[PDB]
């Protein structure tokens, strides 16, 4: 409507943000950044409703202005910064490093990683092209541009970005027998192994990912994220590791815990 | 075959034949043709104010004997001459010429209720005060 829109009512916000429907009629619309607004998490909601460190909106602003959090090495100062998958927030105070990894249920998590793990970030490349001056480059899922990559690196693989130096240190090829991470869709947050794939040269490539419990599901190739080989994950997996128990098994788990 | 098509690919014929056959319904024709917005004196409204032009008296229909003590009121919006009916006993004394009366339906969806011929509306409020209140002596009619 005569230009862009800078607003988000508290009814069209993504449901994985776990926002209520009574505290105000608006939602914290993420600013333009590395990830899409529907596939990321603003810093305000993460610190106010997930970690409960801040209560009000100004408390998040005061914390952010005080140069405390560090997202992907950068301190950042925007309350609506779109932190999505494979985003590490480092806090000099409280001695905690937080990593944004999806859960089995379909939301984000508060997974805590060691300082060594926060030094590296996995990234799924999207485009490989020969740019100006003949220099090759890759386009990771976060939008980072890395020049002069490994020639073996192609589309639909994952690279290990050094974050601190912004250099590729390890690449994982996409083939059968690779542990992946589903990002997006009704089957998001599942972790499994690839057995085969039907190419379907018309768009929307499909891959048959199989869970460790012999459960198999179909997810489009655009929603996959290889996170290592079979049995060895290059990243510390979240609790549960995407078992995806049914409603019956979950109820017995609760009754075995209370 | 019960006189109707019964093929798995014959749905237009049933749909069309349904469209023409539902026109025989009184309610279907009354709603879609929109005669309530054209010929209905109220113009698709539950109530209508007007001006009391004169006091009227009509006789009952067969097997009955009474004067219904009606009234002729001109609606404001439409400007049509419409007869009304003052319901309760001793209620014409409250009403008078050049008065604002809030008309209403009579319960037959347009038709005449009983022995009253032609009259299809009843007076509910006069001069801003309800007829029932004055009849029960709960309120008094404003003078001017």
């Amino acid at each position: 409507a005569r230009g862009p829109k800078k607003h988000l009512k508290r009814l069209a916000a993504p449901h994985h943000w776990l926002l209520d429907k009574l505290s105000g009629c608006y939602a914290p619309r993420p600013s333009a950044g590395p990830h899409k607004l529907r596939e990321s998490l603003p810093l305000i909601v993460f610190l106010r409703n997930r970690l409960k460190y801040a209560l009000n909106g100004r408390e998040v602003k005061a914390i952010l202005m005080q140069r405390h959090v560090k997202v992907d090495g950068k301190v950042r100062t925007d309350t609506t910064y779109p932190a999505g998958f494979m985003d590490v927030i480092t806090l000099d105070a409280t001695n905690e490093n937080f990593r944004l990894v999806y859960d089995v249920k379909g939301r984000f998590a508060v997974h805590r990683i060691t300082d060594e793990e926060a030094s590296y970030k996995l990234g799924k490349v999207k485009k490989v092209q020969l740019g100006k001056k003949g220099v090759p480059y890759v386009v990771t899922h976060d939008g980072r541009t890395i020049r002069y990559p490994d020639p073996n690196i192609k589309v639909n693989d994952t690279v290990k970005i050094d974050l601190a130096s912004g250099k590729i240190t390890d690449f994982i090829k996409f083939d059968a027998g690779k542990l992946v991470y589903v990002t997006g869709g009704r089957n998001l947050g599942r972790i499994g192994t690839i057995v085969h794939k039907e190419r379907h040269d018309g768009g929307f490539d499909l891959v048959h990912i199989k869970d460790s419990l012999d459960n198999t599901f179909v997810t489009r190739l655009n929603n996959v994220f290889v996170i290592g080989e079979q049995g060895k994950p290059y990243i510390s997996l979240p609790k549960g590791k995407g078992i995806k128990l049914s409603i019956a098994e979950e109820r017995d788990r609760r009754r075995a815990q209370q | 075959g019960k006189g109707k098509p019964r093929g798995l690919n014959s749905a237009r014929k049933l749909r069309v034949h349904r469209r023409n056959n539902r026109w025989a319904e009184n309610n279907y024709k009354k709603r879609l043709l929109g005669t309530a917005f054209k010929s209905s004196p109220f113009g698709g409204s539950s109530h209508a104010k007007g001006i009391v032009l004169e006091k009227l008296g009509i006789e009952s229909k067969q097997p009955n004997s009474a004067i219904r003590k009606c009234v002729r009121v001109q609606l404001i919006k439409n400007g049509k001459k419409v007869t009304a009916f003052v319901p309760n006993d001793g209620c014409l004394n409250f009403v008078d010429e050049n008065d604002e009366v809030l008309l209403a339906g009579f319960g037959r969806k347009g038709k005449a209720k009983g022995d009253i011929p032609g009259v299809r509306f009843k007076v509910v409020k006069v001069s801003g005060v309800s007829l029932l209140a004055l009849w029960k002596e709960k309120k008094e009619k404003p003078r001017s």
Binding site: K9, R10, L11, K21, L22, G24, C25, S246, I247, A248, R251 | -
Partner: protein
């Protein structure tokens, strides 16, 4: 532009409102259980219809059905929790065989009578509304509470009530002050 709140009607008026047989039935039930409005009977019947409809939809599905099993035990567990269904009747068929009297018996008004602290259901109602009776450590003034076989042992006089010790009360003080001053 805030999200609107959700509201629902919890009672269903009878299709035949004018019938002597049904009219006397609810009058007997209301008087026996101490109910003022027959909408209370309309409400409790509405809840019975909903659970019966939900249970009926479950009984048209085959055994070992994840949807039928999960919701079936959840509804059964809730019913046996609230005390309308006995432990040996947890088979999803007696759920359709529940009546209004069974639900009415679980109301806190009837439980107060049953434990013997009101001597009359109408006296239970005034005790309910006058805050002389509490559940656990919380004062409840709603006649319809539906105790669930676990708080039934916690039904007792509230600590902040003249009947259960505490400060003697309002009209007692006026009478006590009047006689003390008369005798002084």
């Amino acid at each position: 532009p805030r999200a609107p709140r959700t509201y629902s009607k919890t009672y269903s008026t009878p299709k035949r409102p004018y019938e002597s047989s049904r009219l006397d039935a609810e009058l007997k039930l209301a008087g026996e259980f101490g109910l003022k409005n027959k909408k209370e009977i309309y409400r409790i019947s509405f809840q019975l219809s909903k659970i019966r409809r939900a249970a009926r939809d479950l009984l048209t599905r085959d055994e070992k059905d994840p949807k039928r099993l999960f919701e079936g035990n959840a509804l059964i567990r809730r019913l046996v929790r609230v005390g309308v269904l006995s432990e040996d009747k947890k088979k999803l068929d007696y759920v359709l065989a529940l009546k209004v009297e069974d639900f009415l018996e679980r109301r806190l008004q009837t439980q107060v009578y049953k434990l013997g602290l009101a001597k009359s259901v109408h006296h239970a109602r005034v005790l309910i509304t006058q805050r002389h009776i509490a559940v656990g450590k919380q004062i409840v003034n709603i006649p319809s509470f539906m105790v669930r076989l676990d708080s039934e042992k916690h039904i007792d006089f509230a600590p902040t009530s003249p009947f259960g010790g505490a400060r003697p009360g309002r009209v007692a003080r006026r009478n006590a002050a009047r006689k003390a001053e008369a005798s002084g």
